[PDB]
Symmetry: C5
Subunit: 206 residues, 5 copies
Amino acid sequence: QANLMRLKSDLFNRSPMYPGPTKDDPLTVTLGFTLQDIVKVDSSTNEVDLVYYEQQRWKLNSLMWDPNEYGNITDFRTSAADIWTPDITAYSSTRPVQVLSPQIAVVTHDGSVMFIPAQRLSFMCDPTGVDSEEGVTCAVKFGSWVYSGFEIDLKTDTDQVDLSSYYASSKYEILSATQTRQVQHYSCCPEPYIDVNLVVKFRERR
Amino acid sequence: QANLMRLKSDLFNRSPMYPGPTKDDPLTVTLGFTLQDIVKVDSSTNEVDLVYYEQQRWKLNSLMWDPNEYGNITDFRTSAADIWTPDITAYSSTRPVQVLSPQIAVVTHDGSVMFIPAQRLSFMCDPTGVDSEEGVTCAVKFGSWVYSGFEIDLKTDTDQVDLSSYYASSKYEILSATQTRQVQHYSCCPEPYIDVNLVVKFRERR
Amino acid sequence: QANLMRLKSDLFNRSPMYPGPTKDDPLTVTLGFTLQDIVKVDSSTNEVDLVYYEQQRWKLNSLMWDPNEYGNITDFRTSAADIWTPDITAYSSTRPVQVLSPQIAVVTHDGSVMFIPAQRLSFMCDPTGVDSEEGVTCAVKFGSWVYSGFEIDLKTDTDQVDLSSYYASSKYEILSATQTRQVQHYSCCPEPYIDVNLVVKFRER
Amino acid sequence: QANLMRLKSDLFNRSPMYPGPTKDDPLTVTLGFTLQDIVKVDSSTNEVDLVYYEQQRWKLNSLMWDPNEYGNITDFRTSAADIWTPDITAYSSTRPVQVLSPQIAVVTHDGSVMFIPAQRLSFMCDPTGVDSEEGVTCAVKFGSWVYSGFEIDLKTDTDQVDLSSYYASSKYEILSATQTRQVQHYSCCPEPYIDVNLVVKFRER
Amino acid sequence: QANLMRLKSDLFNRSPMYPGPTKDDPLTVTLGFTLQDIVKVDSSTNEVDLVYYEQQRWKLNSLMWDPNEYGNITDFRTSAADIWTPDITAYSSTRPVQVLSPQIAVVTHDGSVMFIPAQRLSFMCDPTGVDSEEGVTCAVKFGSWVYSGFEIDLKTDTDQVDLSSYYASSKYEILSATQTRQVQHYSCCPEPYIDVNLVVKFRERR
Ligand SMILES: O=c1cccc2n1C[C@@H]1CNC[C@H]2C1
Ligand SMILES: O=c1cccc2n1C[C@@H]1CNC[C@H]2C1
Ligand SMILES: O=c1cccc2n1C[C@@H]1CNC[C@H]2C1
Ligand SMILES: O=c1cccc2n1C[C@@H]1CNC[C@H]2C1
Ligand SMILES: O=c1cccc2n1C[C@@H]1CNC[C@H]2C1
Ligand SMILES: [Cl-]
Ligand SMILES: [Cl-]
Ligand SMILES: [Cl-]
Ligand SMILES: [Cl-]
Ligand SMILES: [Cl-]
Ligand SMILES: [Cl-]
Ligand SMILES: [Cl-]
Ligand SMILES: [Cl-]
Ligand SMILES: [Cl-]
Ligand SMILES: [Cl-]
Ligand SMILES: [Cl-]
Ligand SMILES: [Co+2]
């Protein structure tokens, strides 16, 4: 604009597409959840539905630029189609995830990307005891579906989920909520795979 | 149409795509809601469903033209794909929004655009008390998901929502409906983000 | 096929896309409905679901050709993607419309197009009294969403909806069904907008 | 694969796309149904849901080749996107049809195509009497939506639907099932349109 | 990485698309299921809903490369769009399958591909007797929809379904689960068609 249009041109159209991470140029994705609502519980199927937004951060050398060569531009918004994004996936979903926010990300001159999709998720959770004082506890792992730890590592900035935006008049009160890095192994493949395990504890409101 | 086909060619095909707003060339979007129906209430999940159309207006120098150079044409309809549109998003939705109108916008010679999507929206709202005289109040914020106030500002032409087309046989009567600009901050980011807060107060009819 | 492939090439690939109608070159779309079923009624939300097909006709000079220059071809079927179509839209829908027929249209050498989408539609309608003798009446307007009357006019060939293909064992019987041109005004805009108002009166049993 | 990749190249990429049939180069589609399950019945609406796969066969000169010129290849599988397919459409559906099988077809050197989509279909059917010994009978017509009989004809190899794969523990027993060619006429158009009428008779267990 | 972008270019953009298998160059796909949950049962329609992921393996000469010619790269992740995939299909589904995992596969230098879609599946199954001690048994065949045994053969690495990741608090307990190769014939066609028959026996938990 002229600078931003040129910048995006140089970054995207004039290089071949970034082919994702590898054992030789791996990545670390930082995840953090903001829980907005436990919407629904179904005790006949043991499905529970969450609404949250999930903050993703990572960094690529292929997205770096010098602001002085581009009119002192330090960052920009762009369609998530223009860039690689990680295949962060819920391991116990029961319906495809529904996206609630536009697919746009923020890129910064140092190569860092931030992307914060809002989602509705149905997952496997037995709510028995939700009607009590002690409440019930459920959990779901998030991680790359296809990339091992040697390609994609995960971390959290804090193990405390953000509950400052939780709907004050939800049918369910959140007692506590945790996000914790973990390591899994699968029969398909030799390497360790990384997830962040979201653990919520909740109950019917007074 | 000779002139119109040429005009659209000159504007779209012969310039590079407008890359969205920035801190240096920011925008103001004007929003106004027209509420058509409160369709459904679900007291088991605290979700409520609205149908409205949402008027958006903004202006771009990159869409200006001189009507004399183009057969005294002052405006035209065009696919919303041909142009940039703002990522106006509901902050407490619980299902993806459903679009009820075609994705076509109106562009005027002075650069102004008008775009009025019709939508059905499920959002977080506790209807307890709806069956009473006093009714119940619920609220949902609309704003850019990814653009700060330094890129996208919002305003309303009036803080009264338009109820002139509200369904006369809806199960719910509107007592009041309000659209009001506000400023938020989030954990992700230092900058201020702008929303318009739609506040409806309603009850079972008779 | 030689001729038809060439014809379509000449019409579509070798001209710039028709940019829709304007105040200087406006259009008239002719609409007619064929009601097949009232499927469902929901008294708890006042939504009612219809299945119909909706006949659209209009005409463009940019789609004319001389049959002699193209092997005496007078018409052809083509994907609705290949051509401009009008943005005919239900003003009181409560869910996106669901399409039940393929998106293919008929173009004739004189420039006329015919396009008949089948749809299921949920719209705002209070069914109270449907269980009675007198039945109940509901209505929904169809028209362009974005084009004024100075760009798109509507007309019907007849104000009687076509009930010749209505499901004989539907849960609801049609007492009358009407399609009538009308004029509306909106807060956004000074110009008049045109619809055809479909008015159905029906009952159980 | 050398030969097959070349063959497909010669057929698809090096000719212009086949523009569908016409009065001068019409075709005949052969239809046959295999009923797998009556899944659901809804007596509140009078919708009933079927799962079947529908066999389609037709033939095009534009898909012929000589197997000697291509390594003695007599046929191949290909994406249904690569080829024209007929717009066979249920006239009394109440929801868009859901596709349960991949969209791949078989082409043979003589130009014949075979395509067998599996579908779930909701259609207009009143189940009253389903709970009895005699059961109930319902019907739905399948045919081209936009092509007349002068462009697309239909036939069946047999009027007996194939029930050898019907789910033995469905909630509903099929008593009988029929597929029969028919001719319809419409107010839009002068020409006759062709369907195959699927007629099922069934009951609760 | 330079090498990977080039590799993918050489494999995909610079060859004509692989046209699937034939009688002269047939394939064998290896299938294995990992059952995660029996989610729901509907006795009014005899539909039952499963969540599993299905491991697919096969091998193509057209996907081979020499790691030395490409910076000692032995494998990579890629969009399933970039490659042929087999048309493995459930013969008694009642709704389209819902995909729960991203559509990405792993390719290895020897030409082998691995692809593991997660799915939710509604299929024809009568649950009468599920409430008892003996439980009930249901079955669904998976195989190519269009390719005969002379084009696509199937095999399993083991006839035991993997129940190591089955939801411990599902409403239904698995008594046994089996995956077994089998041969069918159809009226359309003279050739034999191959499936793997997944047979599950289950009951209400207690
Ligand atoms: O699709 C792949 C591809 C590679 C590896 C795996 N999967 C799927 C399973 C869940 N993710 C980890 C592991 C098993
Ligand atoms: O995706 C982004 C991108 C940039 C900023 C933000 N988000 C998501 C949240 C909602 N909007 C404001 C803030 C937090
Ligand atoms: O989108 C437009 C664009 C132009 C005009 C209008 N709309 C939407 C509303 C319904 N139709 C008339 C009016 C208001
Ligand atoms: O779409 C067309 C196009 C041409 C003719 C027709 N239709 C649809 C209706 C059903 N088929 C026959 C008739 C009416
Ligand atoms: O679509 C085809 C194409 C070829 C063969 C078949 N079908 C479908 C049915 C199920 N698969 C085997 C057989 C019958
Ligand atoms: Cl600039
Ligand atoms: Cl002109
Ligand atoms: Cl509903
Ligand atoms: Cl729901
Ligand atoms: Cl649209
Ligand atoms: Cl010809
Ligand atoms: Cl329904
Ligand atoms: Cl060969
Ligand atoms: Cl259902
Ligand atoms: Cl029974
Ligand atoms: Cl459900
Ligand atoms: Co006749």
